[PDB]
Amino acid sequence: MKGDTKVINYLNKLLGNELVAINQYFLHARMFKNWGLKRLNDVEYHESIDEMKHADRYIERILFLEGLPNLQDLGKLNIGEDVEEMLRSDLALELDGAKNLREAIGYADSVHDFVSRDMMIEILRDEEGHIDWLETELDLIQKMGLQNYLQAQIREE
Amino acid sequence: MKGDTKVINYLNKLLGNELVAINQYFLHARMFKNWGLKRLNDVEYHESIDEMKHADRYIERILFLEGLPNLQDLGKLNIGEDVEEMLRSDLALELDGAKNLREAIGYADSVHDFVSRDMMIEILRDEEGHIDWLETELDLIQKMGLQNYLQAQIREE
Amino acid sequence: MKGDTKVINYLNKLLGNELVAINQYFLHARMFKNWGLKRLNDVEYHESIDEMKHADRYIERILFLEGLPNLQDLGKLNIGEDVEEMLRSDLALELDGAKNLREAIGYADSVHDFVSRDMMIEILRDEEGHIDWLETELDLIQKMGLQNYLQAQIREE
Amino acid sequence: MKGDTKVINYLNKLLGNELVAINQYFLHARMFKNWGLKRLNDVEYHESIDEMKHADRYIERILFLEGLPNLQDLGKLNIGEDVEEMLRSDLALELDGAKNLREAIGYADSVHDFVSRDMMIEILRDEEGHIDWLETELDLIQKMGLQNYLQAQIREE
Amino acid sequence: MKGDTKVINYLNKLLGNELVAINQYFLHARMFKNWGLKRLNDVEYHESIDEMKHADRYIERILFLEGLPNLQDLGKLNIGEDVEEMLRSDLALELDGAKNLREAIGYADSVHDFVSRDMMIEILRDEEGHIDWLETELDLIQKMGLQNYLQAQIREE
Amino acid sequence: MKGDTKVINYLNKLLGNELVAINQYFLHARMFKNWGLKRLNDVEYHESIDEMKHADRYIERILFLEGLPNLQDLGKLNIGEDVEEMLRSDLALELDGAKNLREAIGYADSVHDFVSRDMMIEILRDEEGHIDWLETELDLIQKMGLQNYLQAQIREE
Amino acid sequence: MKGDTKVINYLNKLLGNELVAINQYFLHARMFKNWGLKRLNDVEYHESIDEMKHADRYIERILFLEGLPNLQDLGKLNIGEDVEEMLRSDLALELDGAKNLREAIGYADSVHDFVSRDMMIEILRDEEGHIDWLETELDLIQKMGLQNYLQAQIREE
């Protein structure tokens, strides 16, 4: 079913955000795993999987709308080198992605693509959950100090 | 069964104490939850539920005694802005309510309302348990230091 | 994640509506229970629980958006003295709350807070369910007469 | 297998009767449901389903006999505005349908389409069951009075 | 609860679209069944059921809003005489109905009937799924040729 | 119980038809089995079994009515040499048998042997099902072509 | 444990190959899904998952060897526009990756990194399995023709 060209463009932009996050979350997860921070490996791995599900949804929606999903272009990752930098980079990426989502959701409504909008709102709700988790972890690092924080990650939850 | 007017007045005062505590414990729980202090969310949530049960018992008793339960007036909440402050506020509220319970229990005895007294004694035993828990947590904050204390709250027990 | 100030104000207003309804439904339920109208006790109790869930969602959303939930102010309850008067008062409260919800949902869309909007639409759906139930009960009182209506409430369903 | 032209015509006429009854029973059920008359929603819904099964049998028989099922033409519904009026309308429709069935059953026999006749006799037996139920309910409204009758419908049976 | 008159008119228009589709899908299903195309009978039958569910939701919503559901008027069926023709007709009907849904969804938003809107968005998501299925089947007829396509339908999947 | 002589004569004629069909269906089944067309073996074998059941019913009915079942005379088989020929021959036999059944059913009614008639109507319903199956397969051969049709028979259904 | 710099460089090159294949296989899978070719969706999806597992192994190995996994650079995808083109492109990518694996396996042996080598040989065995599958499907398209081939993909295996 032929979709709106700019809706497809938004879907590809958001798909692009998801592809960066999939890789960044996954690399962070395995960095945490290497360092023995099992709990952070588990959560970040889960976040990567969640972004994969989102990417899949964008891909299928774009195809249904008769557009071409773009998995070729990959945006900039910012890996970081310590736990705080890594989590802050994931947070910055989530915030940029949420801004893109809000713009796309408003636009989809205006051209009456209510199903694409509904999909995007569910994904945005997911992203805000990730934002909440990242903000909370960053605050905990400050509240309990980095040494206690790292200790609290070595066992799975 | 027409009850003693002053007993009903005490039950409404105690109901009022419970209504403040229900809201204060519940808000504290969700603040703790927001901050990632899962253990404190769990305990404060269950304390809110306990106070709800007490409130229900007062409402039912007042209605049996043919009085009018007052759920309209709400006493002063003191939320606090950090963990120690919030727990100290909960403890102060518990102590104030225990003072009112002791008065009411003595009075109900003087007018031979032994069933209302029996109900309030069970509720007071409940509140002294909350007092014990709050006192103990506050002591632990001082003994292990705030950073260790916060770390100990992030996993459910 | 810092939310829009007016959205947070709306959420607090709606939270306020839920807080009135929680108490009014709960007192109505126990009044019905006292009178032996078991069926009405069961329904109104479950409606009170439903509004508690809504209140919880508002409290959590407000805290996420870095606002301060207001559980201190409690709006006007209208208890009523007979079954029809009590149900009419619950209906009036539901209808006032639905108006507030519609205004907030429109505004959340305007400022692109689609996740707060999604939450409120779910809550509004729940509220219209309560309205449906209340309207239906009030019509039944008129159609079968009060004596038959009361007889119909003494067994749990 | 090429069927008799007038047998196919009768089947389409009967199918036409069932199509009206499907919609009228269904709308009646949901009207009853809206009014809180659960027992009447349940019965009328099941009657709508029964007529759907009959419609299915006619459609399949017409196609087997190489005719064209007519689902385009819809005869007159008579909804009515109160319980007695609605049930009387359903009864009138059943009685007209039964007349048509009797005529078709005699004709099918005359042209030796004994399998179409056998199908129609089973359907007619079903319809007379509905007529029995409707007559019984209408008599009950008169014997116990409308207020008692409505009270008897609020719980599923 | 007295609804918006124009929302009710849209709900009746959409209900009308559903009623045509219910009949058209069901007849197509049984035509496929008669031809031995079991897979196509199964899918089209379930699409008919899906449209019945949508019709039910519209009927219940309209009654809640104190309108009168129109099951009397039935729009034009376009049955068709061969598999491709039939599937194309179902697709054309889906596309017309989606256009009506988009219009109604936009309007309900303007009058703040967000629950009616939410219901219609879910139904639109369902219809776009049917559109996807129909488009895909039509393309398959072209890609594998009609003889292979028909062979692929004779066993249930 | 002494039956009507001409009813018994009809029952023997019908039994005769069944006896030819039992053999023709069984041989067809095993020819298809030899050819590797497992699906056709399965169905035709089942049809032979069905005709055995019918023959058993006629034999038992004739004996109850104090007549002599005739299993000695066997009418003409037309085996055919390819799938289409074989299926057409089964269809022609079914059609001839159905005309005989119709005559016998009308006659039984005229002499008030309603039990023999009832038995024959059930059997006729069964034969029309075989007719529907054969007509459908023959059409499928034409629509998908013989090569696809044969391919579709090699696996069991 | 500090690894050999050129081994890490090989591991990143191989990881790079896997990253292209993950995306190319996944997009191919969802294109096939959109087209109704369920069998090809299932297999290609599985191949994408397999390449994710390989990528995970490289990432973990690189980190153990104290290098930096490169998930930022993504090589050229060649999506293609029809089934044969898409499959040939997957085959070409697999063949390019296998040549890289062979080079890396020989090199790892020369610097005595036998564990990295062992990991890569297992992965190469997996890729040759994908190569066998793709070569086989491409031959089948030719042997049975595209129309039969597409028909064979519409059901899950």
Question: Chain G residue closest to E144 (CA)?
Answer: G147
Contact C115 A121 (CB under 8 A): yes
Interface probe for G, chosen from E42, E128, E133, E136 (most Cβ of G below 10 Å), is E136
How many alpha carbons lie under 13 Å from residue A3 in its C-beta half-sphere? Answer: 25
Interatomic CA distance for residues D101 and G24, integer angstroms: 63
Length of chain A: 157
Return the structure tokens found at B109: 């005895």
Query: G113 vs C17, G103, G119, CA distance in Å?
Result: 68, 14, 10
Q: Suggest the residue from A131, A143, A151, A153 to mutate for an interface test with chain B (most B CBs closer than 10 A).
A: A143
Of G140, A51, B152, residue with least CA distance to A59: A51
Q: Is D36 left (phi over 0), alpha (psi -120 to 50) or beta?
A: left
Selecting from G30, G72, G76 the residue whose C-beta is nearest the C-beta of A74 gives: G72
Contact (CB, 8 A) for C66 and C2: yes
Question: Residue B64 is nearest to which of C34, C56, C77, comparing CB atoms?
Answer: C34
F9 in Cβ contact with F68 (< 8 Å): no
How open is the CA angle A121-A122-A124, to the nearest 5 degrees? 60
Give the whole-angstrom CA distance, residue A3 versus residue A27: 35
Whether residues E155 and F151 touch (CB distance < 8 A) is answered with: no
* D24: nearest Cα among D94, D71, D61, D78: D78
| Interchain contact G/C (3 or more Cβ pairs less than 8 Å) | no
Angle at E127 between CA A117 and CA A66, to 5 degrees: 65
Q: Which residue has the tokens 């102060």?
A: B92
CB hemisphere CA count around G15 (13 angstroms) = 25
Q: How far apart are alpha carbons E116 and B121 in whole angstroms? A: 52
C136 reaches D (C-beta below 8 A): yes
Buried/exposed code over D119-142 (b: 16+ C-beta within 10 A; e: otherwise): bbbebbeebeebbebbeebbeebe
Rounded CA separation D109/E99 (Å): 49
Query: Would you state the structure tokens that stand for residue B114, as one six-digit string?
Result: 């032994």
Contacts of C65 in chain B (CB under 8 A): none
- Taking contacts as CB-CB distances below 8 angstroms, the residues of chain A near B151 are 144, 148-149, 151-152
Query: Experimentally, how was this structure solved?
Result: X-ray
Q: Taking each helix axis as running N to C, give the angle between helix E114-144 and helix E38-64, from 0 to 180 degrees, rounded to the nearest 10.
A: 170
CB contact under 8 A, E115 and C128: yes
With beta carbons less than 8 A apart as the criterion, state whether F138 and F91 touch: yes
Tell me how close the Cα of C51 comes to any Cα of chain D, in angstroms: 23
- Contact residues on chain D for C139, CB-CB shorter than 8 A: 35-36
Using only the alpha carbons of chain C, give its radius of gyration. Answer: 17
For residue C3, what is the nearest residue in chain A, using CA coordinates? A128
CB nearest E77 (choices: D27, D72, D76): D72
Question: Residue B35: which of A139, A152, A157 has the nearest Cβ?
Answer: A139
Answer whether G121's CB lies under 8 Å from G54's CB.
Answer: no
- Identify whether the C-beta of residue B146 lies closer than 8 Å to the C-beta of residue B83: yes
Q: Amino acid identity, residue C98?
A: A
Task: Select the residue from E34, E151, E156 to test the F interface by mutation, using most F Cβ atoms within 10 A.
Answer: E151
Per the structure, the complete domain to which residue A45 belongs is given by: 1-157
Q: Measuring CA to CA, which residue among E103, E83, E105, E92 is closest to residue E131? A: E92
- Residue that has been written with the tokens 């444990």 in this structure: G1
Q: Do B71 and B52 touch, CB atoms closer than 8 A?
A: no
Question: In terms of C-beta density within 10 A (0-12 exposed, 13-18 middle, 19 or more buried), how is residue E76 classed?
Answer: exposed
Mutate which of A38, A44, A51, A74 to test chain G, going by most G C-beta atoms within 10 A?
A74
- Touch between chain D and chain G (3+ CB pairs, < 8 Å)? no
D 27-86: CB under 8 A from E: 27, 30-31, 33-34, 56, 59-60, 63-64, 68-69, 71-72, 74, 76-77, 79
The CATH code of the domain that includes G31 is: 1.20.1260.10
Q: How many CA atoms lie within 13 A of C149 on its CB side?
A: 16
Q: Let me know if chains D and C touch, i.e. at least 3 Cβ pairs under 8 angstroms.
A: yes
Q: Residue F67, Cβ neighbours under 10 Å: how many?
A: 18
Q: How far apart are CA E109 and CA A116, in angstroms?
A: 17
Search chain D and give the residue with CA nearest E73: D74
**DSSP characters for G32-73?**
HHHTT-HHHHHHHHHHHHHHHHHHHHHHHHHHHTT-----S-
Give the distance from residue E156's alpha carbon to the nearest chain F alpha carbon, in angstroms. Answer: 9
Buried b (16+ CB within 10 A) or exposed e, A23-55: bbbbbbbbbbbeeebebbbbbbbebbebbbebb
Task: Determine contact: E114 vs chain C, CB below 8 A.
Answer: yes
Pair D144, D43: CB distance under 8 Å: no
Annotated ligand binding at D51? The verdict is: yes
Cα torsion angle, D2, D5, D11, D12, sign: positive
Given a contact as 3+ CB pairs under 8 Å, which chains touch C?
A: A, B, D, E
Mutate to test the interface with A, among E91, E121, E123 (most CBs of A within 10 A): E121
Among B19, B8, B6, B131, residue whose Cα is nearest residue B75: B19
CB proximity list for D5: less than 8 A, separation 6 or greater: D67
Beta strands in chain D (DSSP E): none
Alpha-carbon gap, residue A118 to E118, rounded angstroms: 10
* C-alpha distances out from residue E90 to C45, E80, E85, Å: 48, 10, 9
Which residues touch B80 (CB under 8 Å, ≥6 apart)? B28, B86, B88, B89
**Chain C residues closer than 8 Å to B72 by CB:** 23, 74, 76-77
- F102–D contact, CB cutoff 8 A: yes
Number of domains in chain G: 1
The secondary element (H helix, E strand) that includes residue B70 is none
Q: What is the DSSP string of A65-109?
A: TT-----S--------SSHHHHHHHHHHHHHHHHHHHHHHHHHHH
Residue with tokens 């009967």: D14
**F94 closest CA partner among F146, F59, F136:** F136
**D118 at interface of F, judged by CB pairs closer than 8 A:** yes
Q: Shortest CB distance from G36 goes to which of E136, E145, E151?
A: E136
DSSP C152: T
